[PDB]
Amino acid sequence: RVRH
Amino acid sequence: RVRH
Amino acid sequence: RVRH
Amino acid sequence: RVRH
Amino acid sequence: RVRH
Amino acid sequence: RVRH
Amino acid sequence: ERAGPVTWVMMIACVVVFIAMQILGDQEVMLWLAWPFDPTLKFEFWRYFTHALMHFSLMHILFNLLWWWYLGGAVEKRLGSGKLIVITLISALLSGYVQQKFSGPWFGGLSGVVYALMGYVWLRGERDPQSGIYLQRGLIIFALIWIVAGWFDLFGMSMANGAHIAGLAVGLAMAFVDSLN
Amino acid sequence: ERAGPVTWVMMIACVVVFIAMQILGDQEVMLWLAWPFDPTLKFEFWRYFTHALMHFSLMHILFNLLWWWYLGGAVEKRLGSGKLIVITLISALLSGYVQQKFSGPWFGGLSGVVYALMGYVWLRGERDPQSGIYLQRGLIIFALIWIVAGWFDLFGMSMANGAHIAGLAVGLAMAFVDSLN
Amino acid sequence: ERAGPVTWVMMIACVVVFIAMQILGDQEVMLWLAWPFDPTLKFEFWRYFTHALMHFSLMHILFNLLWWWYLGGAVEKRLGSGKLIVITLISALLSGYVQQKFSGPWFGGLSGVVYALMGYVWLRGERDPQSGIYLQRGLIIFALIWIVAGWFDLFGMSMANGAHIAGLAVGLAMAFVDSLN
Amino acid sequence: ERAGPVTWVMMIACVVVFIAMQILGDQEVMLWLAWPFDPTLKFEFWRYFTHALMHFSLMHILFNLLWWWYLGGAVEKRLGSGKLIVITLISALLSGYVQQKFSGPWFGGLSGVVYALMGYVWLRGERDPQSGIYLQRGLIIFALIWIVAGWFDLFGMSMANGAHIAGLAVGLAMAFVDSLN
Amino acid sequence: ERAGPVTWVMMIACVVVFIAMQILGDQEVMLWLAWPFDPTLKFEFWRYFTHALMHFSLMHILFNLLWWWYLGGAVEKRLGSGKLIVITLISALLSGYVQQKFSGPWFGGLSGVVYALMGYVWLRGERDPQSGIYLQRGLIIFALIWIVAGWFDLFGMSMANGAHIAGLAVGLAMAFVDSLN
Amino acid sequence: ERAGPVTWVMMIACVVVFIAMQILGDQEVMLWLAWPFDPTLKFEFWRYFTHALMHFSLMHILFNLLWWWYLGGAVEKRLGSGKLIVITLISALLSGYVQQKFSGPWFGGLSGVVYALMGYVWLRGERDPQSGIYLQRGLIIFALIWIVAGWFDLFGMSMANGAHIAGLAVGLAMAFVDSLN
Ligand SMILES: CCCCCCCCCO[C@@H]1O[C@H](CO)[C@@H](O)[C@H](O)[C@H]1O
Ligand SMILES: CCCCCCCCCO[C@@H]1O[C@H](CO)[C@@H](O)[C@H](O)[C@H]1O
Ligand SMILES: CCCCCCCCCO[C@@H]1O[C@H](CO)[C@@H](O)[C@H](O)[C@H]1O
Ligand SMILES: CCCCCCCCCO[C@@H]1O[C@H](CO)[C@@H](O)[C@H](O)[C@H]1O
Ligand SMILES: CCCCCCCCCO[C@@H]1O[C@H](CO)[C@@H](O)[C@H](O)[C@H]1O
Ligand SMILES: CCCCCCCCCO[C@@H]1O[C@H](CO)[C@@H](O)[C@H](O)[C@H]1O
Ligand SMILES: [Cl-]
Ligand SMILES: [Cl-]
Ligand SMILES: [Cl-]
Ligand SMILES: [Cl-]
Ligand SMILES: [Cl-]
Ligand SMILES: [Cl-]
Ligand SMILES: [Cl-]
Ligand SMILES: [Cl-]
Ligand SMILES: [Cl-]
Ligand SMILES: [Cl-]
Ligand SMILES: [Cl-]
Ligand SMILES: [Cl-]
């Protein structure tokens, strides 16, 4: 889902 | 984040 | 099982 | 805690 | 370590 | 696999 | 011998969406397919249903499609393609409605429809054995465990609680209606 | 076509216990159903068996009941309900005894009984093919992997090692006894 | 009724290797069975194939052998033991070659062979229905999901990407060749 | 230069309990030290406090004792040993009371006391700077994040929600009382 | 003795955003604060910077803010508030630009800025010791490990690779520029 | 103010090895640096020590180096560089010897040396306070918890049990020897  |  |  |  |  |  | 056209097309649609989510990213697909999350998207009618097509992990898609393949396939074989279509549309729309009410629009998966199918197949077999459909005993157990696990949060994933209760209710209500002579 | 009465009643009893554990909490159920953990509970005879009914996670219950449904169902179908009952009681009692000896009373699950059923069904098929029961080749492999995984701690859960070895031994011994003419 | 001799012997060989890996340790077995990792091991011909026998966890072995049991069993039943042997040797050798090229010699598992079997069984059924083999619709879906999960790294394990693409290619190529009249 | 006698004795008591839990098992220690879970244990007065001594994992004990060492040490250094003792007893007793009310007696850890110390040290510094105690700015941030994480369930462990809110309330109330002149 | 106004206001802003993400949900906050993800949002100038304020888990926020508190605090103390502001704006804008180029707009966190601060503080200390700033030896090690872990994907979280390389580059370039006399 | 030359060079050597393990792969580095695993490697003397340089994850390296930085730095500052060197060589060699005896050669990390340093610094402070070294009270607690966690397998990683007990023994023995006048 999201890149950190 | 999302509900499954 | 247990609450922390 | 418990053995399975 | 290893590729599966 | 390895011991730490 | 094999899954009918509705059972199959749902499976293929979920895989196709899942591939798009890996290539494009989940968020980008959610923008297109999620329940309307802004008033400007309220007439994009597909969104009231396409939340059911999105899955967020391997275990998420695998177990949803395994239950759909079994229960959807049974419905379609014994009661026909049209029956499966209508159970799918009603459960998807109503389960999305309740989920968004409790927790907003950021949810997905086929499990509102699956829990409807569990309730439906079990209850129709109990109340209307002459339909030719029923939930085999052993699968009652595992369906029950799946219900408990959704309800008590045992999957290790944040749960669409509203979708789950609304789907199961829908499936039971439809079986009730369908069992009247 | 379907699971017999003993196969079914065990499944239902495990689900009912599992629901109670989610609603009441695990500890509260363990107080009632665990192997006697104080001398004051030594005559509460059910405890020597009801440890087998408790499960601690979704994967724990699902995989125990999947094996029971298959192997228990086979025993009950080919050898009858009474045979399944006796294998269940002996394996539950003896596996609990050994587990408590090695590691005390805080354990649960149906896997002493399951490992007894693995040994039993395999050995009876090998030694007494005319019984009508046997462990199909592919399931021998997976039963073997399940044994290895219990023994070498590959499940990601703390293992009831005493229950496992005692159950498998029991099931083999019973098959041995039952194969004598 | 049951898995043929090639299907079975591969399963048994994988379990036997897996037991050795638990008793001896993984590294010690890898020293013996891995793709040659030093020029002094280049003539130890078994190594170009035995990488396929090693598995590193319970989920790794279980899911590889579940797919092999199904697809290998189908090949062996419909096309014979020799056909399964040749698909196994070609896919193991070529998938190892590509994997080592991309990422070196420290890899293992049966999934180069499995992905070859997926491609093979599906394509042969499509192009040569009179063979008597095919990939049932529902299993197409799950095979597809398995492919996506390997390719996009959805298993929670480091992936032998070269083995995967090379195996699937091999299986498709062989089906192509076998479907010519 | 170093932790005072109360700060130290709590740390040692928690380690000693933690060792006992590893050697004896968690359940066996819980039987002895948990909030009274049967009417027959209602006069075992230590139980209204000793729930604070039990920890269930490495991360559980490490982070509780890290915060206690810092905040308890500060209290003891600036306000004295007796002050730390009274904050500890009040927060342990009241946090246990609220937790058991919401969710029953199966809980443990020092975090009711820790959250009391967070509230106490912060509020006393704000309202009564002449005390010589305060919560340094950067630690306000991390204390705040710890509060958010307890409240929104971000630790990956089931939370004693009642203990947390009751502890923080206690610590704020005590700071309020102590800041009146 | 304590964190300056810029160090503090960033910490507070991140916590405030993190609370909003727990209360409102992550997606809803991302809609407001993410890098522009539709051409209609291109003039919402805050978005080129506010991606740095969002964090997705406890470990994500804790470790970003721990490094910021240390390095930002050092910059602000030795070089002043304005210097910290400019390093923050440049690193946030440029790291967002590169990340979105490689992987699209769905990313967040303070680690573009943090990796800029690592490079900056280390290089300025090396090239311009008379500045009064430097990265203490032991923290060089841990900063290096943090760099390796981001680069080789060792955090167990999907990495904003473009943000990381662009931030570190920025911080080094600024130190270079600032060390010229 | 800062880590001495021995403290630093060990940290740098561990990072350099860790980078090599990410670029080359772990196995390839293990081949070079592990305790001799074949009789042909028995005279490659570095191997009796270089097992201490390898780490297998971010948490593995971070926590080993955090303890080394603290305890090694203290030893080096108060007792000198040569003392740290000798404690390091003895603990690395002896901890490797015991670990390989119990479990073979496939192990790594700095924790034999770290546990030696824990024992050493604590015991030397207790028996020989005039040395100028000691283990501060709060760090006694955390060192104790680290010991318990290694011994009872609480890290979520397979433990080099032989290395741990042998290192701690070594460090205690050396402190004993060093405290005699
Ligand atoms: C077998 C492939 C299945 C993939 C999932 C399909 C999702 C369908 C929703 O898309 C929408 O469909 C409308 C037609 O009703 C179009 O008007 C609209 O522009 C389009 O956005
Ligand atoms: C299908 C439901 C299965 C749920 C599990 C049942 C556990 C049975 C143990 O309980 C005990 O049974 C005794 C009768 O033998 C009673 O005397 C005793 O007071 C009671 O505590
Ligand atoms: C059913 C058991 C399967 C276990 C796996 C077998 C791996 C076989 C590789 O071993 C090698 O076989 C050669 C013979 O070709 C020998 O010359 C050589 O010395 C030996 O190292
Ligand atoms: C430094 C070691 C700390 C270990 C934790 C101590 C827990 C104390 C509770 O035990 C109880 O203490 C009572 C005295 O008040 C006894 O009357 C009672 O029988 C005993 O059960
Ligand atoms: C200390 C609290 C920090 C919380 C994070 C603040 C994010 C700021 C972005 O919001 C935007 O700010 C603009 C002003 O520049 C407004 O014009 C716009 O409408 C608003 O959407
Ligand atoms: C600061 C960098 C630290 C990296 C780790 C160094 C490992 C040293 C072991 O290597 C060996 O060193 C020998 C010299 O004693 C050589 O004879 C031998 O060929 C070489 O293999
Ligand atoms: Cl099908
Ligand atoms: Cl919900
Ligand atoms: Cl059944
Ligand atoms: Cl055990
Ligand atoms: Cl079979
Ligand atoms: Cl690869
Ligand atoms: Cl201290
Ligand atoms: Cl609670
Ligand atoms: Cl501060
Ligand atoms: Cl990226
Ligand atoms: Cl330093
Ligand atoms: Cl060991």
Residue numbers in the entry:
A (entry chain C), B (entry chain C), C (entry chain C), D (entry chain C), E (entry chain C), F (entry chain C): 8 to 11
G (entry chain A), H (entry chain A), I (entry chain A), J (entry chain A), K (entry chain A), L (entry chain A): 91 to 271
Could you share sentences copied from the article?
Rhomboid intramembrane proteases are evolutionarily conserved proteins with numerous important biological functions, including growth factor secretion, regulation of mitochondrial dynamics, and membrane protein quality control (Fleig et al., 2012). Rhomboids are serine proteases with a Ser-His catalytic dyad (Wang et al., 2006), and they recognize their transmembrane substrates in a two-tier process. It is assumed that first a portion of the transmembrane domain of the substrate docks into an intramembrane interaction site of rhomboid within the plane of the lipid bilayer, upon which a linear segment of the substrate (possibly generated by local unfolding of the top of the substrate's transmembrane helix) interacts with the water-exposed active site (reviewed in Strisovsky, 2016a, Strisovsky, 2013).
To understand why peptidyl ketoamides are such efficient rhomboid inhibitors and to establish the basis for structure-guided design of their improved variants, we determined the co-crystal structures of GlpG with 9 and 10. The complexes were formed by soaking the inhibitors into apoenzyme crystals, and the structures were solved using diffraction data to 2.16 and 1.78 Å resolution, respectively, allowing detailed comparison of their binding modes. In both cases, the pentapeptide RVRHA binds the active site cavity as an extended β strand, virtually identically to the binding mode of Ac-RVRHA-cmk. In both inhibitors, the ketoamide warhead is covalently bonded via its proximal carbon to the side-chain oxygen of the catalytic S201, and it engages in a network of six hydrogen bonds in the active site. The oxyanion formed by the proximal carbonyl oxygen accepts hydrogen bonds from His150 and the main-chain amide nitrogen of the catalytic serine, and the distal ketoamide carbonyl oxygen accepts hydrogen bonds from both H150 and N154, thus amply saturating the hydrogen-bonding groups engaged in the stabilization of the oxyanion (Cho et al., 2016). Furthermore, the ketoamide nitrogen donates a hydrogen bond to H254 and to the S201 side-chain oxygen covalently bound to the warhead. The resulting network of six hydrogen bonds probably helps position the ketoamide warhead in the proximity of the hydroxyl of the catalytic S201 to enhance its chemical reactivity in a conformation-dependent manner. The tail substituents of 9 and 10 (RT9 and RT10) interact with the prime side of GlpG, buried in a cavity delimited by the side chains of amino acids F245, M247, and M249 from the L5 loop, W236 from TMD5, F153 and W157 from TMD2, and residues V204, M208, Y205, H254, H150, and N154.
